[PDB]
Amino acid sequence: SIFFSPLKYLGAEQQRSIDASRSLLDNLIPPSLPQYDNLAGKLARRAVLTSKKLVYVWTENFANVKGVPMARSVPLGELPNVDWLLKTAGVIVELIVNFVASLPASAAAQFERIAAGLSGDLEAARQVHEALLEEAKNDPAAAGSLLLRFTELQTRVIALLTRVELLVDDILKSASNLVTGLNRFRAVFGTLRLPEVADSFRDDEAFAYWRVAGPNPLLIRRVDALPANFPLGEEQFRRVMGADDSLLEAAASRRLYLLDYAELGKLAPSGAVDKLLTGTGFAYAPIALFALGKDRAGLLPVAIQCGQDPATHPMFVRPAESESDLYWGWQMAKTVVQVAEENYHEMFVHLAQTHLVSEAFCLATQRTLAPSHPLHVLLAPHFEGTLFINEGAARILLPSAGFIDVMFAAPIQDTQATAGGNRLGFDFYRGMLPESLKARNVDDPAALPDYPYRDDGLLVWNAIRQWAADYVAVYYASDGDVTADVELAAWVGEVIGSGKVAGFRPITGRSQLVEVLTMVIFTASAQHAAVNFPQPSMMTYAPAICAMSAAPAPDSPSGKSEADWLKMMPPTLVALEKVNIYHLLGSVYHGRLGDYRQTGFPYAPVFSDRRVTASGGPLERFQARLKEVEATIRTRNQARRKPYEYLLPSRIPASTNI
């Protein structure tokens, strides 16, 4: 049939190459608000938007993440580019090589040939990419006619990664049988350098410092009157803080800070959770009190209650050096808090509030803002690889016996339900950096001076905020241009109606639009960076932090031992999974905030509007201001106890893609 014949030749590779070239042409259109476009442009963009809703499709019944608004599938165009692919394949092949090299010869035979070939094929692909990038340079006028070999390279790396997958499954099918004090926790690294946290994780001031400069800087809050369920009294406080101090004066001088994990819900099973693959696991919803001394030199831990009900969880107080009989009970209570922390951090702060929020903004943007809408142009780079990585999360990390089931004590269907619930309850406006710092009363550096996430995050937040304002003003001259924009209004409708983004509301003016975009951009870029890139240095070593414990919380502050603490350490399989997935997820830096060039070949500018790209213009100013931020952070880091480098703009990707 004449009507069918084109289908034969029209494969996926051809279609990716077709979309890539279409991409670059549609790139030429000067962007416009729909009300300022001409009749022809209005008709074409309504047609494209209809076609966009074919390809970008909402579901709330995606595998393993029921309830969460997701893409039904990742469009061909949204598959990662060669550059991301090579990078990520590179890390996983390194980790495979490291692992096989750590096995006895007998057992290595399973994998050693497959691994050698994966490593050699990656090397052949990298060399291809290099030579392709050399011919473009030698003849840049012919550059556009090399894109097809870049798409061909893309097909080759995808196939590499499918083979990489088959090996990882075979290794991890066998790991429980392959795995062999804290000796086992160092052995899992193989040749990987152990993080610095492995040498100081027992230090009490280091433990407090997690609250302000660790992977979860969001939960800590000021407390003015302690709640009934945390019955710490003045004698206990004064025992830690000195007789010249008191709860009452500490409260009043804004020196008390509470860490309360009540919101974990089923992520903190009420008791033992026995699993075949990992044995008996526990996790917790503790409450910990921290305080500043009068000089506010630094936060100190004061007391830890290992669950919500004091009638069933005793109060653990910071011991003195001399108090050997309290030493181990206290190390157990800290471990409890860190078990809560991995759960809170990874499920809520990382997965629910970055990844899964950006999912919804991605889908709404592609479905309702035309490709030539200025806000599409602005936002699209900040979603690159987001749909792909999150489908990765759902499929690969969240099923039975997957990484999350292995690494987090809860039953996997409780984990999935609690993660998704936190996403659905997450309020877009309350979740804004300035709003979070106000609501928790941690916004004033004279009360809480050392808080690197706050002070470094405000630099980045405010830099993005000026950029958004500068950019909106190019296109929207008044509030009426905002309310007359039918695309922006449809986007709002979908963010609420399909995206289920709590707290989202009509946008009725420019200042509010700026705040909205600032949130969307910051969430995709800096917030993600801040909570994802700690994983390799802070969360790869299981005795410092793990989302499951093999023993219950300590039953008494007194009389515990080293043996009793060691009981809490997880099985070896958990530690093996931990080091590998956390190295991986924090080792791919793809794209950079403010660059706004394509991150794949031909690496073209994002913005063609000469008003945006003008010398001294909005984009240049944002790029200049990020470099000023870098320099200020680097200066701050000279005076800090440890550098906090996650919010250096040079380390912040534009998008959430790992």
Ligand X SMILES: CCCCCCCCCCCCCCCCCC(=O)OC[C@H](COP(=O)(O)OCCN)OC(=O)CCCCCCCCCCCCC
The nearest distance, CB 455 to ligand X, in angstroms, is 26
Cβ atoms of 407 and 535 within 8 Å: the answer is no
Nearer to ligand X, 291 or 351 (CB): 351
* Residue 529 near which of Fe ion, ligand X, none (CB within 5-8 Å, type-dependent): none
* By the rule CB under 6 A, 573 interacts with ligand X: no
376 labeled binding residue: no
Residue 538 contact partner, candidates Fe ion, ligand X, none, CB within 5 to 8 A by sort of partner: none
User: Which of 44, 187, 396, 566 contacts ligand X by CB under 6 A?
Assistant: 396
**Nearest-10 Cα torsion for 234, 237, 239, 244:** -80
In the complex with Fe ion, the residue whose CB is nearer, 375 or 521, is 521
Count residues near ligand X (CB under 6 A): 28
Which one of the spans 392-400, 476-484, 498-506, 550-558 is the region binding ligand X (CB under 6 A)?
A: 392-400
Residue 168 makes contact with ligand X by CB under 6 A: yes
The partner in contact with residue 171, picked from Fe ion, ligand X, none with C-beta cut-offs of 5 to 8 angstroms by kind, is ligand X
Q: How many residues bind Fe ion (CB under 5 A)?
A: 1
Q: How far is the CB of 357 from Fe ion (least distance, A)?
A: 12
Q: Kindly report the number of other CB atoms within 10 A of residue 623's CB atom.
A: 16
d(CA 338, CA 412): 20
Q: Quick one: what does residue 397 bind among Fe ion, ligand X, none, with the CB cut-off 5 to 8 Å set by partner type?
A: ligand X
Site for ligand X in 532-561 (CB under 6 A): none
| β-pair partners for 605 | 597
460 binds, among ligand X, Fe ion, none (CB under 5 to 8 A by kind): none
Stretch that binds ligand X, among 293-301, 442-450, 513-521, 578-586 (CB under 6 A): 578-586
- For residue 602, whether the previous peptide bond is cis, meaning omega lies within 30 degrees of 0, is yes
Query: Cα(627)–Cα(461) distance, rounded to whole angstroms?
Result: 14
Contact with ligand X (CB under 6 A): which of 56, 58, 62, 99? 99
Nearer to Fe ion (CB atom), residue 308 or residue 532: 532
Q: Is there binding between residue 171 and ligand X (CB under 6 A)?
A: yes
What are the tokens at 576? 């093996």
Short-list 377, 383, 400, 644, CA closest to 520: 383
By CB under 6 A, is residue 358 in contact with ligand X? no
What letter represents residue 271's amino acid? G
Output the 3-class SS for 7-66.
Answer: HHCCCHHHHHHHHHHHHHHHCCCCCCCHHHCCHHHHHHHHHHHHHHHHHCCEECCCCCCC
Q: CB of residue 392 vs Fe ion: minimum separation in angstroms?
A: 10
Cβ contact 564:572 at 8 Å: no
**Is residue 489 close enough to count as binding ligand X by CB under 6 A?**
no
Which of 96, 501, 568, 629 touches ligand X by CB under 6 A?
Answer: 96
Q: Report the alpha-carbon distance of residue 517 to residue 521 in Å, rounded.
A: 6
Q: Is 345 annotated as a binding residue?
A: no
164: contact with ligand X by CB under 6 A: yes
Give min distance, CB of 532 to ligand X, in A: 8
Q: Does 395 bind ligand X (CB under 6 A)?
A: yes
Chain residue whose CB lies nearest ligand X: 392
Given the complex with Fe ion, which of 34 and 649 has the nearer CB atom?
649
Report the number of secondary-structure helices (H) and strands (E) in the chain: 29, 9
Residue 106 tokens, joined:
């007998």
Task: Please say whether the beta carbons of 268 and 343 come within 8 A.
Answer: yes
520 to 539: interface string for Fe ion, x by CB under 5 A: ------------x-------
Closest CB to Fe ion among 577 and 609? Answer: 577
Encoded amino acid at 452, one letter:
P
Where does 476-567 have alpha helices with state H?
A: 479-483, 486-497, 510-522, 528-532, 535-538, 562-566
Our CA angle for 315, 321, 323, nearest 5°, is 55
The residues with which 257 forms a beta bridge, in sequence order, are 222, 290
Candidates 149-157, 257-265, 387-395, 641-649; binding stretch for ligand X (CB under 6 A): 387-395
From the CB of residue 140, how many other CB atoms can be counted at a distance below 10 Å? 11
Comparing C-alpha atoms, which of 365, 645, 451 is closest to residue 440?
451
Q: Is 528 annotated as a binding residue?
A: yes
Q: Which is nearer to Fe ion, 366 or 532 (CB)?
A: 532
Could you give the dihedral angle defined by the CA atoms of residues 403, 407, 410 and 416, in that order, rounded to the nearest 10 degrees?
-30
Residues 6+ apart with CB under 8 A from 33: 373, 374, 475, 476, 481, 485, 487
Binding partner at 168 among ligand X, Fe ion, none, C-beta below 5 to 8 Å by kind: ligand X
In whole angstroms, how close is the CB of 162 to ligand X at the nearest point? 5
Q: How far apart are CB 250 and ligand X at their closest, in Å?
A: 36
Cα separation, 548 vs 532, in Å, equals: 20
Minimum gap (Å) between residue 72 Cβ and Fe ion: 22
- The answer to whether residue 92 forms part of the interface with ligand X (CB under 6 A) is yes
Query: Rounded to the nearest 5 degrees, what angle is found at the Cα of 336, between the Cα atoms of 334 and 340?
Result: 115
* Closer residue to ligand X in complex, CB, 230/541: 541
**How far is it, in rounded angstroms, from Cα 573 to Cα 634?**
38
Q: Which residue, 261 or 622, has its beta carbon nearer to ligand X?
A: 261
In the complex, minimum distance from the CB of residue 391 to Fe ion, in angstroms, rounded to a whole number: 13
Rounded to a whole number of angstroms, the minimum distance from the CB of residue 390 to Fe ion is: 9
Q: How far is the CB of 265 from ligand X (least distance, A)?
A: 17
The CA distance from 168 to 160, in Å, is 12
Distance in Å, CB of 656 to Fe ion, minimum: 6
Count of positions (residues) in the chain: 658
397 is a site residue for ligand X (CB under 6 A): yes
Please identify which residue in 392, 602, 617, 643 interacts with ligand X, judged by CB under 6 A: 392
Shortest approach of ligand X to residue 392 CB, angstroms? Answer: 3
355 binds ligand X (CB under 6 A): yes
CA atoms within 13 A on the CB side of 590: 30
Given the rule CB under 6 A, which of 113-121, 157-165, 222-230, 422-430 is the region that contacts ligand X?
A: 157-165
17, 32, 88, 598: which one binds ligand X (CB under 6 A) = 88
C-alpha 131/C-alpha 128 separation (Å) is 5
Which is closer to ligand X, CB of 171 or CB of 553? 171
Would you call 17 exposed, middle or buried from its count of C-beta atoms within 10 A (0-12, 13-18, 19+)?
Answer: buried
Binding site for ligand X (CB under 6 A): 88, 92, 95-96, 99, 161-162, 164-165, 168, 171, 346, 350-351, 355, 389, 392-393, 395-397, 403-404, 407, 580-581, 584-585
Binding site for Fe ion (CB under 5 A): 532
> Binding site for Fe cation: what residues are annotated?
350, 355, 528, 532, 658
> Binding site: what residues are annotated?
350, 355, 528, 532, 658
